[PDB]
A paper describes a structure:
Lipid transfer at membrane contact sites, such as the ER–plasma membrane contact site, is facilitated by oxysterol-binding protein (OSBP)-related proteins (ORPs). Most human ORP proteins contain an N-terminal pleckstrin homology (PH) domain and a C-terminal lipid transport domain. The PH domain recognizes and binds the target membrane, while the C-terminal transmembrane helix anchors [name] to the donor (ER) membrane. In the case of [name], the cargo lipid is phosphatidylserine (PS), which is synthesized in the ER but needs to be transported to the plasma membrane.
However, despite years of efforts, we have only been successful in elucidating the structure of unliganded ORD8. The structure was solved by molecular replacement using an AlphaFold model. The RMSD between the model and the refined crystal structure was 1.44 Å, and the structure fitted the 2mFo-DFc composite omit map well. The overall fold is reminiscent of a β-barrel composed of anti-parallel β-strands. Compared to the well-studied β-barrel structure, the GFP, the ORD8 domain is composed of more β-strands (19 in total), whereas GFP is composed of 11 β-strands. However, in the case of ORD8, in one side of this β-barrel, the β-strands are replaced by three α-helices. The fold is therefore actually a mixture of alpha and beta. This observation is consistent with the previously reported structures of ORP2 and ORP3 that exhibit similar fold with RMSDs at 5.27 Å and 5.32 Å, respectively. The structure also revealed a rather large cavity (its volume was estimated using spaceball to be approximately 1860 Å3) in the middle of the barrel. This cavity, consistently with the previously reported structure of Osh6, represents the lipid-binding site. The full-length (including the lid) [name] domain never produced any crystals.
Numbering used by the authors: 426 to 774
């Protein structure tokens, strides 16, 4: 079926996790190593609550497709930039880069999409590591993502649950938190779905533990005081303030950017025309297959414009990555132009 389709590219949906980059600026300033992990994890859980259940099925992005967007930080008077590019359609790998130098953090990663069909239920996995770096500290956080289990395609209630075991690891300080997304059992209950449980630990010693639901309250209890507290809850006041995202002017967008590329596919979905939504998709995929043939005909060499593969490590690296800490006497404004994230400085370095 294809009535299960969200009018957003996967590169677009991949940027949803940074609507609370407000938190990451705070974490960069937190001086206690333990409290930085708490605030990093609190940010991680902040990117799953808007997720809708059911039809949601981002577009499989096309090779060379690019999404580019921006967020505004009023309190720190700065901006968080996001750039993602589809580097391979076979395999379906999309790379992303996030940079906010004034607030002292950046993220990089690459995500491979693999699905498995159980008949009535579908499970799409996202495997890959995201590296959060605090520029001023030279301190990295490596984290993975869960997988989405979808039941009710053919018959039964249509649902989307999150499951898996995520590891958020910081080797510099020795801290880490292991999270476990728990799927509802056969019996089920009013609170069995979206259950999240985890534990914050240093080295191997467990400092504190987490319980709750990832779309609702999550509670932390200290393993030394056994006193419970609210670790994270998406309060409507917290929801009321999600950083405002700014996309590129449609007339200024390249033809292979996500919004311009999928416009006709998106319009069909929003118009509820199911038949013309599939046809418009086949136009893009048929062009991709034809552009893949044309490539093999004379020279099969596809240059990713904004990303490049490191042969030694096998990881995808943003061509224009910059990790130098913010220098107030030199750095003036971080900006982006044509997918290139830059900073205006009064001294070249």
């Amino acid at each position: 079926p294809t009535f299960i389709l969200e009018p957003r590219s996967f590169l677009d949906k991949l940027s949803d996790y940074y609507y609370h980059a407000d938190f990451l600026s705070e974490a960069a300033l937190e001086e206690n190593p333990y409290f930085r992990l708490k605030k990093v994890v609190k940010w991680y859980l902040s990117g799953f609550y808007k997720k809708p259940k059911g039809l949601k099925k981002p577009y499989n992005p096309i090779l060379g497709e690019t999404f580019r967007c921006l967020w505004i930080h009023p309190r720190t008077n700065s901006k968080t930039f996001y750039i993602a590019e589809q580097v391979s359609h076979h395999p379906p790998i999309s790379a992303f880069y996030v940079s906010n130098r004034k607030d002292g953090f950046c993220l990089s990663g690459s995500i491979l999409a693999k699905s498995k069909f159980y008949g009535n239920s579908l499970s799409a996995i996202l495997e890959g590591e995201a590296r959060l770096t605090f520029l001023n500290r030279g301190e990295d956080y490596v984290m993975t993502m869960p997988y989405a289990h979808c039941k009710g395609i053919l018959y039964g209630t249509m649902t989307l649950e999150l499951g898996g075991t995520v590891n958020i690891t910081c080797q510099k300080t020795g801290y880490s938190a292991i999270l476990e997304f728990k799927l509802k059992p056969f019996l089920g209950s009013s609170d069995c779905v979206n259950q999240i449980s985890g534990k914050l630990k240093l080295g191997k010693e467990v400092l504190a533990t987490l319980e709750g639901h990832w779309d609702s309250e999550v509670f932390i209890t200290d393993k030394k005081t056994d006193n419970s507290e609210v670790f994270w809850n998406p309060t409507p006041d917290i929801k009321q303030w999600r950083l405002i995202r700014h996309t590129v002017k449609f007339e200024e967008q390249g033809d292979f950017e996500s919004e311009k590329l999928w416009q006709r596919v998106t319009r069909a979905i929003n118009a509820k025309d199911q038949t013309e939504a599939t046809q418009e998709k086949y136009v893009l995929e048929e062009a991709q297959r034809q552009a893949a043939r044309d490539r093999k005909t004379k020279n099969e060499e596809w240059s990713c414009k904004l990303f490049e593969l490191d042969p030694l490590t096998g990881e995808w690296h943003y061509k224009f990555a910059d990790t130098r800490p913010w220098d107030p006497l030199n750095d003036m404004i971080q900006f982006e132009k044509d997918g290139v994230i830059q900073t205006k400085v009064k001294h070249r370095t």
